[PDB]
Design a protein around this ligand. Structure first.
Ligand SMILES: O=C(O)Cc1coc2cc(OCc3ccccc3)ccc12
Length: 188
């Protein structure tokens, strides 16, 4: 077949019931995730190839960066709770990987302050139990599939994208193959 298990995708030996339709995992310490955001725009290109209104979910992970990696998972929960993901994603990526100006939880808070989120707004969300639950939700979704690598995308809790088996000589062809595979899997 043109799409084959082990080539463009792999199949979960333990399917995950009730999972989101399109579930992405990333880390702000993850280099390919940086490319996926700034250079390839995987999330938007996948969204444009899927039916309108399909739920897409993106979660942060703990296993990169130690203490700060967990801080970034809590900060991502704040971003999701406040709905400011589009405002903080790029400065957080660049703060961690490009300028390396993010060395503490205070530095992460500075990114939100600079993006226009009020200090009282950030601190209240950061210490809220709604955000504690969002952190637990991110951990549980990752734990359901024993996630050891990012960037990762799962479709209907059953199929995992395999970008290693996709052509990397051309950035746009890669994105197109990636998005077309997600579409194929969503119609499975
Ligand atoms: O292999 C891995 O650990 C998994 C993996 C995740 O995202 C990737 C992106 C890759 O290429 C992107 C690209 C495409 C065209 C031109 C430059 C870069 C390759 C591998 C992965």
């Amino acid at each position: 077949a043109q799409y084959e298990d082990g080539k463009q995708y792999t199949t979960l030996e333990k399917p995950v019931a009730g999972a989101p339709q399109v579930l992405e995992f990333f880390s702000f310490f993850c280099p390919h995730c940086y490319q996926f955001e700034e250079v390839l725009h995987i999330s938007d290109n996948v969204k444009k190839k899927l039916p309108e209104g399909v739920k897409m979910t993106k979660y942060h992970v703990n296993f990169m960066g130690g203490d700060l990696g967990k801080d970034l998972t809590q900060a991502w929960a704040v971003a999701m709770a406040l709905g400011v993901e589009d405002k903080v994603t790029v400065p957080l990526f660049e703060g961690v990987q490009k300028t390396q100006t993010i060395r503490s939880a205070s530095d992460i808070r500075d990114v939100f302050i600079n993006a226009g989120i009020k200090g009282e707004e950030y601190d209240a969300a950061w210490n809220s139990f709604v955000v504690k639950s969002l952190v637990a939700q991110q951990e549980k979704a990752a734990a359901d599939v024993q996630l050891r690598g990012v960037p990762a995308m799962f479709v209907n809790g059953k199929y995992q994208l395999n970008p290693q088996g996709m052509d990397t000589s051309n950035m746009d062809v890669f994105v197109q193959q990636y998005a077309d595979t997600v579409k194929y899997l969503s119609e499975k």
